[PDB]
Design a protein around this motif. Sequence first.
Motif, mmCIF file in Angstrom:
data_model
loop_
_atom_site.group_PDB
_atom_site.id
_atom_site.type_symbol
_atom_site.label_atom_id
_atom_site.label_comp_id
_atom_site.label_asym_id
_atom_site.label_seq_id
_atom_site.Cartn_x
_atom_site.Cartn_y
_atom_site.Cartn_z
ATOM 1 N N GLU D 93 6.182 52.898 40.046
ATOM 2 C CA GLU D 93 7.164 51.864 40.322
ATOM 3 C C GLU D 93 8.580 52.440 40.241
ATOM 4 O O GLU D 93 9.347 52.306 41.193
ATOM 5 N N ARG D 94 8.899 53.091 39.108
ATOM 6 C CA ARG D 94 10.248 53.574 38.811
ATOM 7 C C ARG D 94 10.755 54.557 39.877
ATOM 8 O O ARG D 94 11.956 54.607 40.143
ATOM 9 N N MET D 95 9.842 55.362 40.440
ATOM 10 C CA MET D 95 10.152 56.294 41.517
ATOM 11 C C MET D 95 10.743 55.552 42.715
ATOM 12 O O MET D 95 11.756 55.983 43.259
ATOM 13 N N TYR D 96 10.086 54.457 43.128
ATOM 14 C CA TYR D 96 10.524 53.678 44.279
ATOM 15 C C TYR D 96 11.838 52.953 43.971
ATOM 16 O O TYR D 96 12.678 52.817 44.858
ATOM 17 N N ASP D 97 11.999 52.470 42.728
ATOM 18 C CA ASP D 97 13.237 51.827 42.295
ATOM 19 C C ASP D 97 14.401 52.813 42.378
ATOM 20 O O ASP D 97 15.462 52.470 42.902
ATOM 21 N N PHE D 98 14.190 54.025 41.846
ATOM 22 C CA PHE D 98 15.212 55.059 41.845
ATOM 23 C C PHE D 98 15.556 55.477 43.280
ATOM 24 O O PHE D 98 16.728 55.667 43.599
ATOM 25 N N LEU D 99 14.526 55.655 44.120
ATOM 26 C CA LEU D 99 14.714 56.098 45.495
ATOM 27 C C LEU D 99 15.495 55.046 46.291
ATOM 28 O O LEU D 99 16.383 55.402 47.067
ATOM 29 N N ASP D 100 15.157 53.757 46.089
ATOM 30 C CA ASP D 100 15.834 52.659 46.767
ATOM 31 C C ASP D 100 17.316 52.658 46.396
ATOM 32 O O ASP D 100 18.168 52.619 47.281
ATOM 33 N N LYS D 101 17.597 52.731 45.086
ATOM 34 C CA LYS D 101 18.955 52.799 44.559
ATOM 35 C C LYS D 101 19.686 54.044 45.076
ATOM 36 O O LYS D 101 20.867 53.964 45.408
#
Lengths: 49, 120, 46, 178, 135, 80
Positions: D93-101
């Motif tokens: 999850e956190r990977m996609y959150d970081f990538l989106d940001k």
Amino acid sequence: MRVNITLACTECGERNYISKKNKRNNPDRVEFKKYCPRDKKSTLHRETK
Amino acid sequence: MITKTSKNAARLKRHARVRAKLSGTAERPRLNVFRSNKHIYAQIIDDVNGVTLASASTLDKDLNVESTGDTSAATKVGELVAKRAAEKGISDVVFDRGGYLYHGRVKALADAAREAGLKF
Amino acid sequence: MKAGIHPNFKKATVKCACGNEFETGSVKEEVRVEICSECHPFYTGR
Amino acid sequence: NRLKEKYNKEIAPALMTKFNYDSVMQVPKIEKIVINMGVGDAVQNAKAIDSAVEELTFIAGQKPVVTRAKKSIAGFRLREGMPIGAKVTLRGERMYDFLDKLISVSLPRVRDFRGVSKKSFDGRGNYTLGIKEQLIFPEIDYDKVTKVRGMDIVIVTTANTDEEARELLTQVGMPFQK
Amino acid sequence: MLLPKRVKYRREHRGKMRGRAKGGTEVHFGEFGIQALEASWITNRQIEAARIAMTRYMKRGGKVWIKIFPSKPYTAKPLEVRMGSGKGAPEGWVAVVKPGKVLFEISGVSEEVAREALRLASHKLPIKTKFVKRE
Amino acid sequence: GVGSTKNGRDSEAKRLGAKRADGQFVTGGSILYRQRGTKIYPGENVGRGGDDTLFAKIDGTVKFERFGRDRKKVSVYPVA
RNA sequence: UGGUGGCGAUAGCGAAGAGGUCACACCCGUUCCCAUACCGAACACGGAAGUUAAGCUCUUCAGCGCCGAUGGUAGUCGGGGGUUUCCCCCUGUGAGAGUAGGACGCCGCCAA
RNA sequence: GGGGCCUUAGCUCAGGGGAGAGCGCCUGCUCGCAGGAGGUCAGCGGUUCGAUCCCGCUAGGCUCCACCA
RNA sequence: AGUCUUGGAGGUAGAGCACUGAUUGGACUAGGGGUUACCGAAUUCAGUCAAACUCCGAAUGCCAAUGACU
RNA sequence: GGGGCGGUCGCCUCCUAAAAGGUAACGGAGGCGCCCAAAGGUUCCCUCAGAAUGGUUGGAAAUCAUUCGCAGAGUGUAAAGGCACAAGGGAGCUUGACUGCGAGACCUACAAGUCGAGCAGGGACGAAAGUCGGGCUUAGUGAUCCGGUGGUUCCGCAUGGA
Ligand SMILES: [K+]
């Protein structure tokens, strides 16, 4: 430098164990739980003062 | 491109390390465990001859549950392997954890075996 | 996640000065940003 | 996560059609993102590591590992085992959150942003991005920063070629240089 | 003068020289060569003296492969010392040659020349040789 | 006049190798091989000592044996 | 087919295809046991939405790696000789290299 | 010949952690100020995470020996 | 005790280049020098060598075992 | 290889050493007179050197990431023999770096030196099997006499003490 030491059964007082430590590394009296054959069980044996 | 070894390959390396020390005699045979994604298995093996003396699994018909591959299933196998082994005249064993951590399912099988006659 | 070393990760509303609001995962609950992807002179091509 | 839904619904079918994959399991995905800060000035200040760990904790939402020196290098005044940087691994999850940001917030705020290089793939579908300043992240308060520090962001994919990976990242929305 | 850029050991055992050559018993690189017929140490001095020799005869016309290298070192004690008290300082370099070793090889030039070239070399060396060709 | 050598030292011999033959009977606790490292491995009814020494756990017949591709082990089998 | 053993890579590596309902996997969850010098990556604990892409299993292949005669040759025990830093001969043994070839697994037990 | 000791900036000397200090010489300032100048650390090859400071050798200079028939 | 038979430990002779050093020529060049083969390290093909090199490896000698003959 | 002068004297490793073992020379090379309270014990887990490709500082060389990669690393220290079911790396808990011993071996002129299953006592780690009487192995040491210190169901010059 590294020195001869005696550990002594903190119970019976029996000078049970010689060994070696480094004093610079280990400057305060080391203690270990090594069998006293007077007491016939493991006791804390502390470096003699 | 990530490339990575199978978890079984990793386990077989761990199982080898276990088997270094631990080994099944005729007197004290080896209670091997294979667990899987879906199932859990147990074979009492005699390594000098290379013979499975007794065996039990979730694929056996006495064990009847839909949630095969959980802790509750493992206890049932651990019972079955022990009782089947008692018929053969097996008492002392060595528990080969099989590369898996002694925990959960694998432990549950071992505990159930200890409860139901076998000695380790 | 080990207890006691990770910041509490929440859903955060990012409010841009151009009026665009988007949900991002963040340790803060609200993030005000002067320039987003939709209003940056680079992305708008102007 | 928005990107995770986009991946499953749009990107993965599109990649399957484009590269004509036999099975869904062959479709390139982002496996992990690793963020890296080389704190070679930690040789002078032990507290510089703690600052970098803290900053990277805010950015990533996850405590990093302090990286230690593998061997002594006299040219950098370096000894083996010395703390010399920070590294974190974002997955799930956190990977996609970081990538989106990263894509939507942080990358725009780069001063004189011309897009990210099309050539920073490794020949095996992994993409590496060098950031000059940590101040691009909105989680970093400008006043608290003692010193400006860059970081390396590695996006690790299951692509076998740079073409596949470049397509994956383009469809995710990675702002490549024209 | 050839000599090794370094060695492991500076003082070595002198050793022996039984048997025919281990390899280097054909002409390989060039067309023609000088085959040894007797065991000997060849010094680095002898090689250079036999090289320059055959070289200058050809008049820059052809190519030489020296098929030995003075890799083994030897020692000597000073002049007029008694025996004992350690092993002597190193002195020079010797390639062990056995029978069969093709020591030089020539190409670029006629046999007529090559023969006469190698003849001139033979005389500098401390062994019997013969001329050979490639097969 | 003469100089002086800087060598001239050496340890005592340490009598390594095989202390019992293949097919030889041995009592329990017999040393079978002395070695640095594990040149020979401990096999059946053999232990490895603190200086890698190989010795008979039982009484029986010695065998040196090929252990894999490369290695060699020694066993003592029970007499019967 | 899975588990699990025995045997020197003749078992290996590579390459090329083939197969999956069950079984093995990848896979999908992290609420809980348990987890990461950071991460459900791994380890655990859960599940079966779909997939043979990979592991796995089965075929073909001698490119590498492996195994490997035979004959000869070096070496050499013993006995002889010589022009002896070495060399020769006689009964016996006999490599290494080279190569003919072999080889893309062989034999268990248990479960389904 | 052998042993023993030495080799650092112009000069005098500090000093396994990346070569200093004074004086001279240059900077501006008129008995102190204010910054510079300048090193193959005799050389070589090596121990190693770095060598002036390891270790082995080569120079050269001093020093002590080189006897008994 | 000798000899035959059987088993074993071990790294010499020889040989080899798989490691460690040494080392020759060609091919092809990082790179550093006068855009260049101007010269080139590695790489690659072939070629040499080793008491303190070994992927190998004898004859002998050694330690045993089982009978037999002596 | 006369004596003097120089050098050396004990221990460890390698080569010489002739494929068991042993083996000389003022033969060829190096180490030692320690270190470590973890660099010991155990349980669980792991894999190294270097290179290629990509990376803000950052460069040949710090830190990532990917692939390749029998070890080209590591193993406190000399060397040799070993070691990747690791003997190498990491973490948790510990003190077996135990007391009494010891079938039987090795080595050996003696004196010494070395290995040891196993038994008992009481432990550590482990679910258990089990492993543990320091350290990958082999140097790191010194007889007796005499004296010091601690302990002690021993002796104590008529007896009790001393
Ligand atoms: K004399």
